[PDB]
Amino acid sequence: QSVSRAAITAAYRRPETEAVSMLLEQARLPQPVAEQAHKLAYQLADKLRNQKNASGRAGMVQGLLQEFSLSSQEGVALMCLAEALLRIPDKATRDALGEPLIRKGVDMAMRLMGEQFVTGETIAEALANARKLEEKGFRYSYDMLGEAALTAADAQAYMVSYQQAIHAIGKASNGRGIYEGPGISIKLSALHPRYSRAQYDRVMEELYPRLKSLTLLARQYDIGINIDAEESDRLEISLDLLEKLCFEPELAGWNGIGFVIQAYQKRCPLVIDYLIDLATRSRRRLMIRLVKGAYWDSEIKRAQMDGLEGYPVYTRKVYTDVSYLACAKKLLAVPNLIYPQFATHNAHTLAAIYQLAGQNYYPGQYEFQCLHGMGEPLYEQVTGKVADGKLNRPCRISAPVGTHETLLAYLVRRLLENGANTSFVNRIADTSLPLDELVADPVTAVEKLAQQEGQTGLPHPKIPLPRD
Amino acid sequence: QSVSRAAITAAYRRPETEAVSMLLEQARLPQPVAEQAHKLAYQLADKLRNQKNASGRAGMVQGLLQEFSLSSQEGVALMCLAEALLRIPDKATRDALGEPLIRKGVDMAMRLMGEQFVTGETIAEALANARKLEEKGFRYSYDMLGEAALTAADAQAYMVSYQQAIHAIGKASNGRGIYEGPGISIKLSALHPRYSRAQYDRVMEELYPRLKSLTLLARQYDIGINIDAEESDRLEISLDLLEKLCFEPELAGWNGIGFVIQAYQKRCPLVIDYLIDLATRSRRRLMIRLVKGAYWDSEIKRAQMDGLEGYPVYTRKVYTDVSYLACAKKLLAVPNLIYPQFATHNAHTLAAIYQLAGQNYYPGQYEFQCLHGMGEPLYEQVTGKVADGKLNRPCRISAPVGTHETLLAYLVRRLLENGANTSFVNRIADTSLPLDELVADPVTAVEKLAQQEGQTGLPHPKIPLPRD
Numbered sequence: 001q002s003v004s005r006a007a008i009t010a011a012y013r014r015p016e017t018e019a020v021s022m023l024l025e026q027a028r029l030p031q032p033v034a035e036q037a038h039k040l041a042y043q044l045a046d047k048l049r050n051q052k053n054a055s056g057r058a059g060m061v062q063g064l065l066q067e068f069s070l071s072s073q074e075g076v077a078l079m080c081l082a083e084a085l086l087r088i089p090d091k092a093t094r095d096a097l098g099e100p101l102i103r104k105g106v107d108m109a110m111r112l113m114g115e116q117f118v119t120g121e122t123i124a125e126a127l128a129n130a131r132k133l134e135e136k137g138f139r140y141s142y143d144m145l146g147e148a149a150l151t152a153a154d155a156q157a158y159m160v161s162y163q164q165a166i167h168a169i170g171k172a173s174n175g176r177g178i179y180e181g182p183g184i185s186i187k188l189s190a191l192h193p194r195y196s197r198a199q200y201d202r203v204m205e206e207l208y209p210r211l212k213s214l215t216l217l218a219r220q221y222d223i224g225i226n227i228d229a230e231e232s233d234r235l236e237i238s239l240d241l242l243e244k245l246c247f248e249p250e251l252a253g254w255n256g257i258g259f260v261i262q263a264y265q266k267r268c269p270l271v272i273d274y275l276i277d278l279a280t281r282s283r284r285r286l287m288i289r290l291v292k293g294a295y296w297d298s299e300i301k302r303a304q305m306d307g308l309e310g311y312p313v314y315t316r317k318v319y320t321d322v323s324y325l326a327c328a329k330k331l332l333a334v335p336n337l338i339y340p341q342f343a344t345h346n347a348h349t350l351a352a353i354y355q356l357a358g359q360n361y362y363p364g365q366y367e368f369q370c371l372h373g374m375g376e377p378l379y380e381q382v383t384g385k386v387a388d389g390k391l392n393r394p395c396r397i398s399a400p401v402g403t404h405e406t407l408l409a410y411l412v413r414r415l416l417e418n419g420a421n422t423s424f425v426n427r428i429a430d431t432s433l434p435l436d437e438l439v440a441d442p443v444t445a446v447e448k449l450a451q452q453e454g455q456t457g458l459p460h461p462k463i464p465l466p467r468d
Numbered sequence: 469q470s471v472s473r474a475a476i477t478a479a480y481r482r483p484e485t486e487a488v489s490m491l492l493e494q495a496r497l498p499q500p501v502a503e504q505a506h507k508l509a510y511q512l513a514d515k516l517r518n519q520k521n522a523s524g525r526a527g528m529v530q531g532l533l534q535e536f537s538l539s540s541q542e543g544v545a546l547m548c549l550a551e552a553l554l555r556i557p558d559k560a561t562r563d564a565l566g567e568p569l570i571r572k573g574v575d576m577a578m579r580l581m582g583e584q585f586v587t588g589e590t591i592a593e594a595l596a597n598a599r600k601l602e603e604k605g606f607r608y609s610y611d612m613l614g615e616a617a618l619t620a621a622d623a624q625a626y627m628v629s630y631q632q633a634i635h636a637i638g639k640a641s642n643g644r645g646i647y648e649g650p651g652i653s654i655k656l657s658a659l660h661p662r663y664s665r666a667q668y669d670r671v672m673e674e675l676y677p678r679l680k681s682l683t684l685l686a687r688q689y690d691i692g693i694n695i696d697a698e699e700s701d702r703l704e705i706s707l708d709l710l711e712k713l714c715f716e717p718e719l720a721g722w723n724g725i726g727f728v729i730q731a732y733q734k735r736c737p738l739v740i741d742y743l744i745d746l747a748t749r750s751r752r753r754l755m756i757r758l759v760k761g762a763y764w765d766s767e768i769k770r771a772q773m774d775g776l777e778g779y780p781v782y783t784r785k786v787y788t789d790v791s792y793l794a795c796a797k798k799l800l801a802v803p804n805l806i807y808p809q810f811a812t813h814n815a816h817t818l819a820a821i822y823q824l825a826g827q828n829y830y831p832g833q834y835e836f837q838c839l840h841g842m843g844e845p846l847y848e849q850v851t852g853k854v855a856d857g858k859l860n861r862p863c864r865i866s867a868p869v870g871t872h873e874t875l876l877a878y879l880v881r882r883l884l885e886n887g888a889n890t891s892f893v894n895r896i897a898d899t900s901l902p903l904d905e906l907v908a909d910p911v912t913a914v915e916k917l918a919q920q921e922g923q924t925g926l927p928h929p930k931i932p933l934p935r936d
């Protein structure tokens with residue numbers, strides 16, 4: 001292994017106290033930036049939570065809930081009475097006065113809950129919905145749903161669907177290019193049967209030609225093509241496929257190759273070192289999507305079943321936040337080698353990146369990204385003209401495309417993300433949680449914990465090492 | 469009285485069978501137009517009701533509500549189970565498994581329900597919220613809340629507030645003119661103490677100088693100034709004030725004077741004849757807002773208490789719809805004399821006007837109008853580029869401005885409008901009412917009734933003549 005590859009391998013499951021301790025100073029926002037990040041986060045979160053005055057309206061209630069000392073069911077009864085009285089037109093009059101059931105229930109609940117996250121059933125239908133937000137400065141990346149191909153036929157169907165999508169998106173793009181125009185994202189698990197346990201030689205012989213073919217096609221249309229990151233035990237093979245791809249003669253001089261890295265992995269900073277080296281050696285700018293990570297629940301369960309030395313991911317959410325900030329700094333440092341794409345729905349994460357990116361923004365410096373159905377509310381404050389009170393930073397929406405038959409795995413990941421009490425999108429709905437706690441700085445949070453617990457970066461109390 | 473004024477007076481309370489019979493053929497859409505109106509209405513209503521697939525989602529439910537023959541509380545219990553099961557991260561595991569209380573209650577319920585209809589507490593705050601929709605082709609008219617001045621001081625305060633608003637809107641308009649730029653609306657009841665019973669000589673001596681002053685000021689900024697229509701027994705005096713205003717030398721050649729007429733009045737078509745004559749004599753194009761009418765409940769109660777020969781308004785909602793269509797045709801016929809502004813939230817009314825207005829639309833031919841908090845959803849399909857799937861017709865939003873202390877009377881009118889089972893905005897929420905019934909043609913509805921009941925335009929069965 002190369003120096004940078006060896007360093008990745010060695011960091012696979014290193015102890016959390018150690019990993020978190022190393023990240024801390026790399027993630028720390030310089031005091032001035034910290035404060036600007038705080039103010040911007042607070043404001044973003046305020047406008048988002050209180051768009052329709054959901055807090056000021058709670059305040060008006062409690063103001064009467066005390067002046068009369070009434071209960072919940074009490075105050076409501078009064079409002080109904082007041083409503084009925086307001087429907088009196090004249091003021092004077094008002095004044096004077098088996099298993100299939102279960103199998104189907106799950107299918108239906110998935111489809112009902114899933115609609116909000118799907119852009120369209122077909123690529124043409126998704127493209128049709130693009131202009132509305134593209135006219136406002138948003139960009140799109142299309143995500144053909146369907147993964148973990150089980151058969152050769154499965155993988156073939158996915159391959160054909162991706163090709164068709166690229167032709168369609170590429171015709172829609174119409175020369176707009178990899179930054180300003182739409183792109184596509186692909187899952188390697190979709191292109192090779194039984195990817196989860198696939199061996200190196202079969203992946204190269206079979207998966208790679210498909211990856212190359214799609215990438216050449218994307219390049220012909222000059223659209224971005226991004227490789228999604230999946231389970232942690234596929235990181236290594238994904239790097240081998242990326243390595244090989246970046247040295248294809250037909251791809252020389254083209255900067256449309258994109259790759260996701262997951263901040264919840266202890267390996268993330270080390271993967272960045274490798275990528276910086278790869279960009280240098282292959283003479284290109286890589287489009288790098290920095291994400292926190294979508295498979296956390298399964299990663300913990302997987303590690304606990306394999307009874308290994310440790311976890312490949314962090315066990316406290318705040319450590320993932322710290323990792324993301326440290327990694328973001330590393331990416332922003334090398335604008336000649338990387339085009340960073342900062343995927344987040346978290347107002348603080350967004351504000352911190354906005355500040356870390358420094359003065360003198362230019363369009364091709366970086367972009368934000370979000371998931372359809374989750375990020376638009378927040379990024380409506382961000383993408384757009386400064387005169388209209390926006391930040392004038394581009395956001396690319398990831399737009400799932402497919403029918404109910406391909407929706408399951410993606411939906412479950414969205415359920416987990418939205419429903420977790422640690423998630424920003426969950427906590428911002430909790431009007432009992434003060435904005436300041438919601439946008440609290442992750443580094444300072446970690447230092448608080450370290451003081452209270454006796455050392456930095458201890459694992460989650462409820463998540464012991466697999467061997468315990 | 470002039471011929472046209474005499475004809476108004478004589479129509480004040482004419483029998484509904486007679487009034488409705490006269491309107492019917494004036495309102496009838498020529499067969500071809502009728503069908504295009506139907507298709508457009510249907511489509512507008514479909515997109516509005518089913519924006520987030522609220523009907524297709526009901527269809528998916530009932531499809532299982534039968535395949536298992538489960539009740540409402542039953543199906544829900546299943547969805548919760550299916551939701552909990554979808555939160556299992558791994559598929560294998562999932563598979564294997566006193567009076568102040570009342571006085572305050574009314575105040576609070578008003579403010580809570582009222583927020584959705586108010587644009588801002590102050591004119592500057594309302595103006596600040598303009599760009600978002602003005603950038604999309606919407607226009608605004610600002611409605612300083614507060615009416616029925618009881619004292620001389622009250623009316624003075626309203627006068628001062630209107631003046632300040634005109635300066636602010638006029639500075640915001642910045643030369644955009646009466647069609648493309650924002651304007652203001654005023655209530656005469658706000659400018660004169662105890663307007664409801666005010667005598668002709670005192671109104672002219674006191675109200676008129678204030679009306680003139682505001683209109684001259686509006687003209688200096690070249691912004692529209694619209695006179696709201698209020699209770700029916702103030703129609704006559706409002707016409708006298710308008711008559712006088714239109715002959716002011718300082719207003720000669722200026723077409724920014726606006727005036728509301730209420731289609732639910734039997735007098736409406738006759739008022740149009742008068743207005744057409746007034747525009748001719750005073751040598752101007754009048755901005756005429758055709759509305760159905762906001763005071764129906766009070767009008768019925770007022771007439772029943774005065775025990776007069778009949779009602780000044782129709783007693784069936786469908787007759788008001790017919791009156792509006794007939795009046796709309798009359799207005800569209802005289803583009804040199806009137807700039808018609810068609811206020812409606814009703815998809816059929818809108819579609820019918822769109823068709824009646826004929827081929828070869830030009831911006832200054834007419835506009836649509838709506839109330840803030842009620843019309844934007846519908847007009848998002850209407851105002852905008854044809855390429856984006858819109859109708860490319862302008863809509864002017866009426867935007868209430870003021871604090872909770874001025875909100876009461878307006879809110880009650882909105883409660884009545886929204887809550888009435890006869891209102892389009894109520895029925896469109898009723899997913900059990902088929903789109904075709906919702907957008908049913910009013911003339912054909914009236915003819916159906918006439919066949920079933922034995923004659924055309926009979927009063928509402930539940931609303932006898934006041935003397936019964």
Ligand SMILES: Cc1cc2nc3c(=O)[nH]c(=O)nc-3n(C[C@H](O)[C@H](O)[C@H](O)COP(=O)(O)OP(=O)(O)OC[C@@H]3O[C@@H](n4cnc5c(N)ncnc54)[C@H](O)[C@@H]3O)c2cc1C
Binds near residue numbers: 262417420
């Ligand atoms: C355009 C786009 C593309 C994406 N592509 C991928 C992809 O290819 N692969 C993928 O894995 N994800 C991908 N993601 C999504 C992603 O990783 C999640 O949306 C994300 O982790 C949420 O981060 P957040 O800052 O919005 O929310 P935040 O609420 O700030 O953080 C949320 C989360 O932190 C983590 N976490 C939660 N609990 C813990 C814990 N106890 N210990 C340690 N970490 C914890 C998680 O990673 C998690 O989702 C993509 C997202 C977008 C917007």
Ligand SMILES: Cc1cc2nc3c(=O)[nH]c(=O)nc-3n(C[C@H](O)[C@H](O)[C@H](O)COP(=O)(O)OP(=O)(O)OC[C@@H]3O[C@@H](n4cnc5c(N)ncnc54)[C@H](O)[C@@H]3O)c2cc1C
Binds near residue numbers: 785892
């Ligand atoms: C910009 C703007 C300015 C306005 N200015 C005024 C104004 O100065 N004065 C004013 O009075 N209104 C005014 N209105 C509002 C108005 O009159 C109501 O919003 C309106 O009547 C609703 O009509 P619609 O076509 O949207 O709804 P629809 O549901 O199609 O019709 C609604 C209604 O029909 C009528 N109605 C209801 N029941 C009956 C019945 N049993 N018999 C006969 N008629 C019935 C009513 O007039 C009523 O509101 C204005 C509205 C707007 C948008």
Ligand code: PRO
Binds near residue numbers: 143294371398410
């Ligand atoms: O599949 C997922 O969950 C993430 C989110 C978009 C694609 N990668």
Ligand code: PRO
Binds near residue numbers: 696762839866878881
């Ligand atoms: O006051 C009302 O109710 C109507 C609606 C806007 C102004 N005239």
